[PDB]
Amino acid sequence: KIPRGNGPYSVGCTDLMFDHTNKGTFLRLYYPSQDNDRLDTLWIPNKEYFWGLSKFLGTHWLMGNILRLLFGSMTTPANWNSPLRPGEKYPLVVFSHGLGAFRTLYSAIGIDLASHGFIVAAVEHRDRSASATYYFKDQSAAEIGDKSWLYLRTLKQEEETHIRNEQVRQRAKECSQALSLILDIDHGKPVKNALDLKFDMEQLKDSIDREKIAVIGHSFGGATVIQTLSEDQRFRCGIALDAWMFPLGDEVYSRIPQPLFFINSEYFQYPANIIKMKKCYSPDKERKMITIRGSVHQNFADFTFATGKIIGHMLKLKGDIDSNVAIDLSNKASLAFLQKHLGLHKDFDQWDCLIEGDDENLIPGTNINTT
Numbered sequence: 001k002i003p004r005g006n007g008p009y010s011v012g013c014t015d016l017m018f019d020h021t022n023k024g025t026f027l028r029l030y031y032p033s034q035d036n037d038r039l040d041t042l043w044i045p046n047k048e049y050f051w052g053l054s055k056f057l058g059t060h061w062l063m064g065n066i067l068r069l070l071f072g073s074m075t076t077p078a079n080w081n082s083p084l085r086p087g088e089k090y091p092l093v094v095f096s097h098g099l100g101a102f103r104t105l106y107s108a109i110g111i112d113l114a115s116h117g118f119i120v121a122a123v124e125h126r127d128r129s130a131s132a133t134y135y136f137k138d139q140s141a142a143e144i145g146d147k148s149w150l151y152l153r154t155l156k157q158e159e160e161t162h163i164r165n166e167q168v169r170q171r172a173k174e175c176s177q178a179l180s181l182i183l184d185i186d187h188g189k190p191v192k193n194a195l196d197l198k199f200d201m202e203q204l205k206d207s208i209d210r211e212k213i214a215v216i217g218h219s220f221g222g223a224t225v226i227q228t229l230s231e232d233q234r235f236r237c238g239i240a241l242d243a244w245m246f247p248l249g250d251e252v253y254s255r256i257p258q259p260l261f262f263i264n265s266e267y268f269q270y271p272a273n274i275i276k277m278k279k280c281y282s283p284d285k286e287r288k289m290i291t292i293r294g295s296v297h298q299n300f301a302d303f304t305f306a307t308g309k310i311i312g313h314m315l316k317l318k319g320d321i322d323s324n325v326a327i328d329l330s331n332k333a334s335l336a337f338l339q340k341h342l343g344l345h346k347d348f349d350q351w352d353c354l355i356e357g358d359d360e361n362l363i364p365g366t367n368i369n370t371t
């Protein structure tokens, strides 16, 4: 089980694709919902995601079919296509997934944010960093639902620097484009979803607190946080969850005016990576860093909830820390940081001490020694 959110709001979920092409926006939306009696949301909704995941794990695409047999009916606790909870403007989070991931794999995070009164737009990237993604070749294809699938690209060592950077720059553009789509839907623009889903986008009219915008992301998505902030001042702060800093160009480091929070795992980080995070620091800028004790890179994504403790530890899906314990720390510290830098009038300042790494299961800053 992926945990239910800790906040007071029921959670709805839907998907949005606009336009239908490979240059359009594809996102999974988590939102405060009016109703709580809908079907739960299918976690990995298409066989081709399992094929993609199998390719990313270095197994045969038929191991994909075994993963599909085991996980293909798994849900996540969000009311599928539930009506939006009316009568309130909600702050917006744009969320960026890691390498080998896709839009649906960070629901523990998206559901928790939505339960505290956020709308969350978890983008699916078309940069070939997703395990799989899909789109439609043209209008005819979209209509009949003839999907074109795009699978993860494996790089030669010589391609690494250049292609990771083209990818992080495409990802930032995709974050900005997803922001503009939501803001236009808030500002009442008719949008025909390329997906035929029983969720009317007209509900999102006048629903966004249009200045309370953040960008959050894990791993490759954590670098996407930083690139997005440097290029799009509409994002007011960012939270990088175990950021993988390698994709970033030398230029970006001095170019991030917004508050930025690094939440790291204990076991993923390494000097080269930490050195890059410290390059984002400047005396005029707001920066925070915490490390979750006993945690691994996978503690921020949903696979940490998908198996039991023994298999979980073996597959490096789980750390020494309890997965619910770890995500609560990262989600609660994130809420307090967002309240502070978005100027929210909620009770998220009850977790201010977590921003400073003041908890038995937090390390202030980093455990990693650099020079």
Ligand SMILES: Cc1ccccc1-c1cc(Nc2nc(CCCO)cs2)ccc1C
Pocket (backbone or CB within 6 Å): 053, 056, 057, 067, 071, 098, 099, 100, 101, 131, 219, 297, 298, 301, 303, 306, 307, 315
């Ligand atoms: C547990 C599970 C359920 C359904 C499909 C696959 C798995 C699985 C997943 C991993 N790990 C992965 N990590 C990523 C990147 C995430 C973002 O960093 C993609 S697959 C390892 C082993 C298994 C069986």
Ligand SMILES: [Cl-]
Pocket (backbone or CB within 6 Å): 265, 267, 268, 295, 296, 297, 298
């Ligand atoms: Cl790790």
